[PDB]
């Protein structure tokens, strides 16, 4: 198949409405869309939908022989798939550039920022360690992914629980979720990306761009942040010439945005725990 071409009418109208600082749906430039965080029945599943963009996230575990360079700390395996239901162009093995950049960015952001404790999840140093993989799947594609993918990975890795294990010497004993209560993970800080889109070589900048705004933009600035104001990654794509003050301002924005998103995530987890502590296999949060 193929994506429908973009008419000059829409392009010019968008550029003008930007010049005049007018978005389409009716929001400002420094605003996200209503993001909803919904949970599943199995610890580790989360569907996060911002506006029209829905993304699914599952977290699974295994025990495996670690790699020699790091025989003490475990492993972590990201993967993001762009399901053909996200959009027509997403045939298998065709839109590889987008996959590559997204996956490298997400790996970098979460792994190298040391968001979780790869050490806590050791069982037998040299023989058996955990292996936590996280599979994100793109269901609907309307605009901003990285933010959605990240919020999903984070809600999952904070809403996941391992099968408890006992150990003595080399004797390792795994157990079932019914015999004991699974144990959660160990996070230090939850980073979530923030996407800025540049229009007219750098003059205008938007937040949470829709799909059209992504088609008539020249540049994309991703910025990862925490609630403690700690840059984890920043990336520029699209072949665009920005400056210093622009990234400084974008960072001062990402600060507030990430603080708010984090408050929401925490509220969501609280509500989900409350529900399961009352009978109910769901959990729901709204921006």
Partner 1 sequence: LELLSDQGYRVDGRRAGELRKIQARMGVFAQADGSAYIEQGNTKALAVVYGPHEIRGSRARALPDRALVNCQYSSATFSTGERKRRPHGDRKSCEMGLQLRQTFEAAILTQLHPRSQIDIYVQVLQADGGTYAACVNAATLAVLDAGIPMRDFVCACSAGFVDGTALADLSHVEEAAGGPQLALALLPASGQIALLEMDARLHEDHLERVLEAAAQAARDVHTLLDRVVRQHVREASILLG
Partner 2 sequence: MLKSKTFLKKTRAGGVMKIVREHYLRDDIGCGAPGCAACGGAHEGPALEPQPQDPQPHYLLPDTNVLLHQIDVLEDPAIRNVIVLQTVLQEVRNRSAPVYKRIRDVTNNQEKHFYTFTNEHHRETYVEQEQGENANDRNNRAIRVAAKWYNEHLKKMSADNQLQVIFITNDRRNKEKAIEEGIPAFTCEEYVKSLTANPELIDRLAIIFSEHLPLSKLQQGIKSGTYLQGTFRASRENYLEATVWIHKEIILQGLKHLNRAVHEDIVAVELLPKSQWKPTGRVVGIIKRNWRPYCGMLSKSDIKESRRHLFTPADKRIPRIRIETRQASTLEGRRIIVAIDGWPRNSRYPNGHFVRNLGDVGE
DSSP state of 29: S
Q: How far is the CB of 258 from partner 1 (least distance, A)?
A: 11
* Total interface residues for partner 1 by CB under 8 A: 33
Residues 78-107 that bind partner 1 (CB under 8 A): 96-97, 100-101, 103-104
255 is a site residue for partner 1 (CB under 8 A): yes
Q: Are 192 and 74 in contact (CB under 8 A)?
A: no
Q: How far is the CB of 8 from partner 1 (least distance, A)?
A: 14
SS3 166: strand
Give whichever of 69 and 173 is closer to partner 1, judged by the CB atom: 69
Among 34, 65, 186, 200, binds partner 2 (CB under 8 A): 186
Going by C-beta distance under 8 Å and a sequence separation of 6 or more, which residues neighbour residue 194? 147, 207, 222, 223, 224, 225, 250, 253, 254, 257, 258
Total residue length of the chain: 287
Structure token pair of residue 188: 């230090």
Give whichever of 9 and 68 is closer to partner 2, judged by the CB atom: 68
SS3 77: strand
Q: How far is the CB of 76 from partner 1 (least distance, A)?
A: 15
The end-to-end CA distance of the chain, in Å, is: 35
DSSP state of 61: E
* Total interface residues for partner 2 by CB under 8 A: 17
Residues paired with 58 in a beta bridge? 45, 135
124 binds, among partner 1, partner 2, none (CB under 5 to 8 A by kind): partner 2
244 binds, among partner 1, partner 2, none (CB under 5 to 8 A by kind): partner 1
Round to whole Å and give the CA distance between 259 and 244. Answer: 23
24 binds, among partner 2, partner 1, none (CB under 5 to 8 A by kind): none
Binding residues for partner 2, rule: CB under 8 A, are: 68-72, 119-120, 122, 124-126, 167-170, 186, 188
């Amino acid at each position: 198949m193929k994506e429908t071409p973009l008419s000059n009418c829409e392009r010019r109208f968008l550029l003008r409405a930007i010049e005049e600082k007018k978005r389409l749906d009716g929001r400002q430039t420094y605003d996200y869309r209503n993001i909803r965080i919904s949970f599943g029945t199995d610890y580790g599943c989360c569907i996060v939908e911002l506006g029209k963009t829905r993304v699914l996230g599952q977290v699974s575990c295994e025990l495996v022989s670690p790699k020699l360079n790091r025989a003490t700390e475990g492993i972590l395996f990201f993967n993001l798939e762009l399901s053909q239901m996200a959009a027509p162009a997403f045939e298998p093995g065709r839109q590889s550039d987008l996959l590559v950049k997204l996956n490298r960015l997400m790996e970098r952001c979460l792994r190298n920022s040391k968001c979780i404790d790869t050490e806590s999840l050791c069982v037998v140093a040299g023989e058996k360690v955990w292996q936590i993989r996280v599979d994100l799947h793109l269901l609907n594609h309307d605009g901003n992914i990285i933010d959605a993918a990240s919020i999903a990975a984070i809600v999952a890795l904070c809403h996941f629980r391992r099968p408890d294990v006992s150990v003595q010497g080399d004797e390792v004993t795994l157990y079932t979720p019914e015999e004991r209560d699974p144990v959660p993970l160990s996070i230090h800080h939850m980073p979530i990306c923030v996407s800025f889109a540049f229009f007219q070589q750098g003059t205008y900048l938007l937040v949470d761009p829709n799909e059209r705004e992504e088609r008539v933009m020249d540049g994309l600035l991703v910025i990862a942040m925490n609630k403690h104001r700690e840059i984890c990654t920043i990336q520029s794509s699209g072949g665009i010439m920005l400056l210093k003050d622009q990234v400084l301002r974008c960072s001062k924005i990402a600060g507030v945005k990430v603080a708010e998103i984090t408050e929401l995530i925490l509220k969501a987890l609280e509500n989900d725990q409350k529900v399961r502590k009352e009978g109910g296999k769901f959990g729901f949060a709204e921006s």
